[PDB]
């Protein structure tokens, strides 16, 4: 029932993500010199360094907010991909499955802690 535990759990999950080879295209903002039409397709860029920085700055109030930004990394990859069989998109799918598998308990524990607090 620790309402604050999600933060360190998210820091650790981001550490695992940064170790994953599948995260390399998503660690920093998409390079506009390599993908010049990127902002024609994608309205809100997102990357894992921005998520980690937002978390470390104390600018997430809940793990749901962090989860929305991470999910935006994946939806941006799906929207930008020229093919659902592309290398970078395939990396995003694997990384999304890994993230979803790990974030589920973080969200559950946080929501349970909040409910216990307001009981
Ligand atoms: O060139 C591609 O296939 C491709 C697909 C998705 C994606 N997400 C971030 S950069 C990027 C490039």
Resolution (A): 1.1
For residue 102, the CA-to-ligand 1 centroid distance in Å is 24
The backbone region for 112, taken as left when phi is positive above 0, alpha when psi lies in -120 to 50, beta otherwise, is alpha
Alpha helical stretches, state H, 1-119: 6-19, 38-41, 48-56, 63-80, 87-117
Which ligand 1 atom lies nearest to the CA of residue 82? 3
Closest CA to 89 of 99, 78, 73, 103: 78
Contacts of 97 (CB under 8 A, 6+ apart): none
Which ligand 1 atom lies nearest to the CA of residue 26? 9
Read out DSSP for 84-97? TT-HHHHHHHHHHH
DSSP letter at 9? H
Q: 48, 23 in Cβ contact below 8 A?
A: yes
- Method for structure elucidation: X-ray
Q: Whose CA is nearest to atom 9 of ligand 1?
A: 77
Q: Which two tokens stand for residue 46?
A: 């997102």
Dist CA 81 CA 89 (whole Å): 6
Q: Whose CA is nearest to atom 8 of ligand 1?
A: 77
Domain limits of the chain?
1-119
Q: From residue 112, give the alpha-carbon distance in Å to each of 9, 30, 117.
A: 15, 36, 9
For residue 116, the CA-to-ligand 1 centroid distance in Å is 42
Q: Which two tokens stand for residue 79?
A: 């929207």
């Amino acid at each position: 029932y620790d309402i604050q535990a999600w933060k360190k759990q998210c820091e650790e999950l981001l550490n695992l993500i940064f170790q994953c080879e599948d995260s390399e295209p998503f660690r920093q903002p998409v390079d506009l010199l390599e993908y010049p039409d990127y902002r024609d397709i994608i309205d809100t860029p997102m990357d894992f360094a921005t998520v980690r920085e937002t978390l470390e700055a104390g600018n997430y109030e809940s793990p749901m907010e962090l989860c929305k930004d991470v999910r935006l990394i994946f939806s941006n990859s799906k929207a930008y991909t020229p093919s659902k069989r592309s290398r970078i998109y395939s990396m995003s799918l694997r990384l999304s499955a890994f993230f979803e598998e790990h974030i589920s308990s973080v969200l559950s524990d946080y929501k349970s802690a909040l409910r216990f607090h307001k009981r």
